[PDB]
Structures are given as structure tokens and as C-alpha cells.
Amino acid sequence: SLVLYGAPYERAVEVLEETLRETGARYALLIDRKGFVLAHKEALWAPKPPPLDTLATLVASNAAATQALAKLLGEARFQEEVHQGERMGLYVDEAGEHALLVLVFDETAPLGKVKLHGKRAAEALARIAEEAL
Amino acid sequence: SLVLYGAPYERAVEVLEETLRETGARYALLIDRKGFVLAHKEALWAPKPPPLDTLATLVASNAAATQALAKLLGEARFQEEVHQGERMGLYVDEAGEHALLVLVFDETAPLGKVKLHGKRAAEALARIAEEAL
Fold it and tell me: Rounded to an integer, what distance in angstroms lies between the CA atom of residue A75 and that of residue B109?
């Protein structure tokens, strides 16, 4: 597949939903490394997100931009990154070769839970994407 | 001051050294938001770092690059970021208005310690830089 659709798509959304419930994050996305959104889910209590195409293309651009740093420091790429503001934070984890799990969260979501469930979710989504894409 | 020199410089290096000891990080740097290195220290057990001007300019470029994301998500800027590879990770924390504390570390440095002491160090270095620069 070049697009995630059908049962893989259905399962990916189900994983993103459970990830929101387990973390308390606002928004959860699986995106490819070109910034295309493969699946997304938003907590019913959260404000409408920013345009998710923009968000995904900036996350994917930054993820590519950071490889220079990982290589400067002697590794191939980073696998995970957390960016924290006063209120809002952004978690991104590799979901296999060609996808990234993105979680947007506020202070009400314990960063430890965001990381712990986020990692499990990226593995599940990697498995789905490996078989599908 | 436009450069950190004299007693402020001396104290900043002393803070970076204690930060390496408290964290177990490889390399510690205070850099300005233009990527200029104000102070740096390296653990005696670690390999020679990558060119620290390059490292600082890439860290500063990325920090600027990420503001678009923070603003997309409704805040002014991120205050802190962690990037983790299989072995190496990179911690960056705001040190006041015009500087960033950077810690480069491997698996032997507990991320919790890196964050906890890193935050204290960025506050101390902010204080030094506020009075000096």
C-alpha cells in the first residue's frame, strides 16, 4: 500500500485512540517521513488542532533536519524526541522505517506515561505499517 | 559584555564541570542563540567531541527551526528538548533569553539526572549570563 486504508487503517486509528486514553494526550498522529498523515485522532475534550497537514510537515521536516546532529554525534538518526514548552509538549517516536508517531500533550498528561505508552504505540504502529505499506 | 570572559566565564565553566559530574554527561556547553560557544567542558573519560562550533551552530539552528512548531501548537517557544538515539542523546534547555545549555550524554547517564541537574545548571548559567552579557 502507498496509503494506509482498510483494516490496517482501522487498527492504526484504534491504537491512536487507546494511546490518547492511556496518556491523556490531546492529539495523536501517525505520519510518514515525508509529512503525509497516515492516521490521526484527537481527544474529544481538546480544542480543534492546528492544521494537521502543517503540523505533520513541520514535524517531518524537523525530524529530517536533526539527522545532521545525530550523525555529528556519531549515530545514524535519533529514535525519539521530546520538546516541552510551559504548557504544551510534543513527543515524536520512530514507528519503523518510514513512519513517526506524534503525540501532542499538555501538563495534565504525565510525561512518563506519554513516553511509556508512546513507545508501545510506535511499536504497534510499526508492525501495522510494516505489513501494510 | 558581548563575550563571556573573566570571573563570569570562570564561574560558568565551574558550573559546566559540576554539571558533568552530577549527570555523567560527555560534553556540556553554554551557547548563545546564534550558535556561538560561550563556555564548554568535556568529561576527561570521553572521546574528543565533534567540532564544537558545528555542534553549537546545528543546536542553535534547530532551536530556531522548532519555534514554528511551538507557535503552531500555541506557545511562544519550547523551553527544553531531548533527542535520544540508541546510545547518544542530546539535552538542550533555555538558559535565559539569549543562551542555551547543551548536554551530550550516553546510556551511562540516567536521563532523569541529566534533566534534573541540567535544569538547575541552566538556571545558574542564566543568572551568570543575565548579569554579565
Answer: 17
